Structure 1
Amino acid sequence: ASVHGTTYELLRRQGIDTVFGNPGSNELPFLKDFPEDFRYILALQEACVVGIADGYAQASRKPAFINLLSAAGTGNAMGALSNAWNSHSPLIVTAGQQTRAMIGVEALLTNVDAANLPRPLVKWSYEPASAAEVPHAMSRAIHMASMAPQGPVYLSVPYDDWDKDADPQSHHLFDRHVSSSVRLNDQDLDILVKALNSASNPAIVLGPDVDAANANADCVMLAERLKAPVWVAPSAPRCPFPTRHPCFRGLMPAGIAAISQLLEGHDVVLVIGAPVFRYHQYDPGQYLKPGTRLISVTCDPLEAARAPMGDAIVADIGAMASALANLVEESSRQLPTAAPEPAKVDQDAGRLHPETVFDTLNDMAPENAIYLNESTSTTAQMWQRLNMRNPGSYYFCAAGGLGFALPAAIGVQLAEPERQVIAVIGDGSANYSISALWTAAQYNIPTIFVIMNNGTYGALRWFAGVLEAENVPGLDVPGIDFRALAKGYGVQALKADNLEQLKGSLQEALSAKGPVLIEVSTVS
């Protein structure tokens, strides 16, 4: 067998059947004779390729496979990889290298010092020393991406390797099963359970690895048993809990002082599947108030190491959440009371308040909708106003890198064809990966894109105001016609300048058979 044949067999035997790519000359020998059981999803720029694959992986809860051209293609994707690192997304990034005979002279398209290029944003990065090693290196990539803590990996392959003879002993790779589905030993787990049972006023904080593990329902049972309020850890990339459950307390502010204040009076705080903590703003103070102790369950040694406070346990989130949910006592305390409904913001017949948009989405979207957020000044209101009952219902750029949501929403929609995906994206953010729209059109992936257009980088204006920073350039982005951009890439386009138009446009979009972009005129 050839390296080509052996590698595709390994991929299919390991459950991979889709290649997200933007093709180049170093990859043609890999892509030729493309297997009939595989599908190829083209995107027009590599940030888009990786964003789509990322959404697909996160929603499918399985690795996604990417193919890019050498250094330039990899380079165009590195902002997307920064998000993927923070979301623990299992991505296998392959990049074609020059033929081995032309690497030394640094022919055009040689990826120089290739393995160093995507560092430090990958778990493992490698170029094999010979063609026959390629299937083994691919096996390593698959497992490195897939083991807890999941994350992106990188493999560089000289284009002449594919046609070479494979090692017959590569067949041992095909069916390898590698597990990191582990939990704390019984003795120490019993100690943890007793500490939770004994707490007088426990609180729970959940992060994105809960949703990645589909541990959401187990966390609901845990919270119900402990009668504990539940917060989502700050800078949340995913939604780990039903947002109208009585225990739910919303998104934590991303500040040190703010969080210790919220946790004041809680004697034991159990954090599951989050860094401790993904703060953002400068908000100095105590990490925890006296009387609060913190216990973190994380899938990632790097998270456990860097937490500035608390104990930690490094284990699989699914296995730990299930065990805890089924082992803790049913507390006799009263179940927390549900948060009150959000206020209706006054809305005239003109430009839309973001609150109006979220309320209307919540009113009209199906109960199993999936939302993506890249409307950076409106996150707090979004979190308060969307009832997200089910797992896998929310995604936000995990490293704060704009250009995620537009392509990721296409990948999520591909992963979940029966769940309507609605991406709420600011006018500024929409541009970073605008060309991803084309993929939705070409493959008829029926994502709805809601562009919140207020003409400015609003979150930056807000932060400037905080800093009392005057005379900052580059904060306004006037003069973008999003309906024209949508037309450019073949996506149906609607406009909503007021509430009645928003309702009409959403009705049309929800009944459409293809992707739709709605440009919403929002308040400045």
Structure 2
Amino acid sequence: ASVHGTTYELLRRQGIDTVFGNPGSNELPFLKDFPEDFRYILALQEACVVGIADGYAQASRKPAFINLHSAAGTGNAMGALSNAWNSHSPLIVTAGQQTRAMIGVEALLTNVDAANLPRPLVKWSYEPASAAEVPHAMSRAIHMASMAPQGPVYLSVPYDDWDKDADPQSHHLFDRHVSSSVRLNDQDLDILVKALNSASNPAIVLGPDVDAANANADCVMLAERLKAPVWVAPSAPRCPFPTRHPCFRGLMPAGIAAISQLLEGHDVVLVIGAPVFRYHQYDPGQYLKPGTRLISVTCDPLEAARAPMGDAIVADIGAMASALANLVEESSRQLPTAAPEPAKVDQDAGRLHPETVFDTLNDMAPENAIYLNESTSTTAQMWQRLNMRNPGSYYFCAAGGLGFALPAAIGVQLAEPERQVIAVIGDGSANYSISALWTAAQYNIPTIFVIMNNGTYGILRWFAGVLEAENVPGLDVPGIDFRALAKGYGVQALKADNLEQLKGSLQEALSAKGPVLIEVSTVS
């Protein structure tokens, strides 16, 4: 068989049946004779290709396969890869290279030093030394992306390789099963369980790898057993816990001092599936107060190594959460009391406060909605005002790289066709990957996009205020008509200039057959 034939057989045998791509001439020999059991999802720019694949991979909890064009295509996606790195997204990124005979002269479309291009944003990055090595390299890519800690990988393939004869012994690749589903050995696990049982005032902090592992339910049981309050680790890319569960305490502020203060009085703090910690603002102080001991379970050696405090255990989050949830004793302490329902902000008949938008979404959206956040000045309010009972209900750019939520919302909706996806995106963020709207239209993927339009890079204007930094250029983004942009890409568009119109538009969007964009006028 050919390299082409063998490679598609490997992909299908490893459960991959969808290619997210933007094609080029180096990729046509791969895409020719495209198998009928595969589906190709086209996006118009590579940041959108990778964003969509990323959302799809995160929601489906399986690897997603991407095909991009040489260096330029790969380069256009490297901002999207920064987010994918931070979210441990299992993305197999392939790119077409020039024919081997024209690589030396650096013909047009030659990806020079190809394996170095996406570094340091990938777990593994490779170009095979011969055509017959391609299926084996593809096998390496699949497993490197998929093993804990999951993450993006890169494979460059000269276009002339695909037609060449494959090694018959490549058949051994097709059904390989590779497992990382490991947990701490019994003796040391018992020691941990005893420390948890002995704690007088335990607290639990959860990160995105819990949601990725669908460990959420086991974490609920663990928190109920220990009678422990549960935070979400700062800069949260996902939601790992029911937000109206009585133990839930919400999103931790992303500051060193703020977090040690929050944890003061808790003798043992168990962190699961998060870096320790993804701080953001400068908030110097103690990493922990005395009296607090921290224990981290992480799937990522890099996270364990760089934590400035605490013990760490490097293992699969699913296997660890399950073991702990079922091993710890039921504490006789009183179960934590649910947090109070956020207060209703005063809302006149004018532009919308973001608190109003979220309250209204919470009132009207289905209970199994999935939200994406790229409205950076309103994240705190969103976490407080949306009741998200189920796993996989929230995504936020994991490296803070804008241009994620709009395409990712399309991939999520493709992954979960029975759960309504609602992306809340600021007017600034909306532009980074605006052309992804076209894919929603073309493939009939009925995502709802809520554009929070305040005319500015809100969070930047705010932080400039904190820095007392005056005369900063480039913070305002007036003059964008988002309904026109949606029309440009074939997506139904609505406007909401006040609360009444917001209710009406959301009602219409929820009932609509296709994707819908709502432009909301929000307060500056």
User: Which TM-score band (shorter chain)?
Assistant: over 0.9
CA deviations 1:170-223 (Å, max 9, x no partner) are 000000000000000000000000000000000000000000000000000000
Matches within 5 A, 1:306-325: 306-325=306-325
Measure how far apart 1:474 and its partner are: 0.2
Measure how far apart 1:242 and its partner are: 0.1
Measure how far apart 1:12 and its partner are: 0.1
Q: Secondary structure, in 3 states, of the residue corresponding to 1:345?
A: coil
CA deviations 1:21-48 (Å, max 9, x no partner) are 0000000000000000000000000000
CA distance in 2, matches of 1:467, 1:96: 46
Measure how far apart 1:401 and its partner are: 0.0
Measure how far apart 1:308 and its partner are: 0.1
Measure how far apart 1:5 and its partner are: 0.1
Measure how far apart 1:131 and its partner are: 0.1
CA deviations 1:455-505 (Å, max 9, x no partner) are 000000111111111110000000000000000000000000000000000
CA deviations 1:268-292 (Å, max 9, x no partner) are 0000000000000000000000000
CA deviations 1:411-450 (Å, max 9, x no partner) are 0000000000000000000000000000000001000000
Q: Secondary structure, in 3 states, of the residue corresponding to 1:25?
A: coil
Q: Secondary structure, in 3 states, of the residue corresponding to 1:84?
A: helix
Partner of 1:46: 46
Measure how far apart 1:89 and its partner are: 0.0
Q: Secondary structure, in 3 states, of the residue corresponding to 1:15?
A: coil
Q: Secondary structure, in 3 states, of the residue corresponding to 1:303?
A: helix
CA distance in 2, matches of 1:14, 1:467: 51
CA distance in 2, matches of 1:25, 1:397: 31
CA distance in 2, matches of 1:222, 1:278: 23
CA distance in 1, matches of 2:491, 2:90: 29
CA deviations 1:329-367 (Å, max 9, x no partner) are 000000000000000000000000000000000000000
Matches within 5 A, 1:271-290: 271-290=271-290
Measure how far apart 1:247 and its partner are: 0.1
CA distance in 2, matches of 1:185, 1:461: 50
Q: Which runs of 5+ in 2 are unaligned?
A: none
Cα RMSD (Å):
0.2
Measure how far apart 1:370 and its partner are: 0.1
CA deviations 1:222-253 (Å, max 9, x no partner) are 00000000000000000000000000000000
Q: Secondary structure, in 3 states, of the residue corresponding to 1:395?
A: strand
CA distance in 1, matches of 2:23, 2:224: 50
CA distance in 1, matches of 2:515, 2:400: 25
Q: Secondary structure, in 3 states, of the residue corresponding to 1:474?
A: coil
Query: Which moved further from structure 2: 295-304 or 461-470?
Result: 461-470
CA distance in 1, matches of 2:94, 2:375: 31
CA distance in 2, matches of 1:244, 1:171: 50
Q: Which runs of 5+ in 1 are unaligned?
A: none
Partner of 1:189: 189
Measure how far apart 1:114 and its partner are: 0.1
CA distance in 2, matches of 1:195, 1:465: 45
Measure how far apart 1:132 and its partner are: 0.1
Q: Secondary structure, in 3 states, of the residue corresponding to 1:26?
A: coil
Measure how far apart 1:119 and its partner are: 0.0
Partner of 1:18: 18
Q: TM-score, normalised by structure 1?
A: 1.00
Measure how far apart 1:156 and its partner are: 0.1
Matches within 5 A, 1:103-114: 103-114=103-114
CA distance in 1, matches of 2:376, 2:309: 29
CA deviations 1:100-127 (Å, max 9, x no partner) are 0000000000000000000000000000
Measure how far apart 1:325 and its partner are: 0.1
Matches within 5 A, 1:77-476: 77-476=77-476
Runs of 4+ in 1 over 4 A off after TM superposition: none
CA distance in 1, matches of 2:351, 2:462: 19
Q: Secondary structure, in 3 states, of the residue corresponding to 1:218?
A: helix
CA distance in 2, matches of 1:464, 1:396: 23
Query: Which moved further from structure 2: 96-105 or 460-469?
Result: 460-469
Measure how far apart 1:453 and its partner are: 0.1
Seq. identity, %:
100
CA distance in 2, matches of 1:468, 1:238: 32
Measure how far apart 1:313 and its partner are: 0.0
CA distance in 1, matches of 2:394, 2:467: 30
Measure how far apart 1:255 and its partner are: 0.1
CA distance in 2, matches of 1:465, 1:412: 36
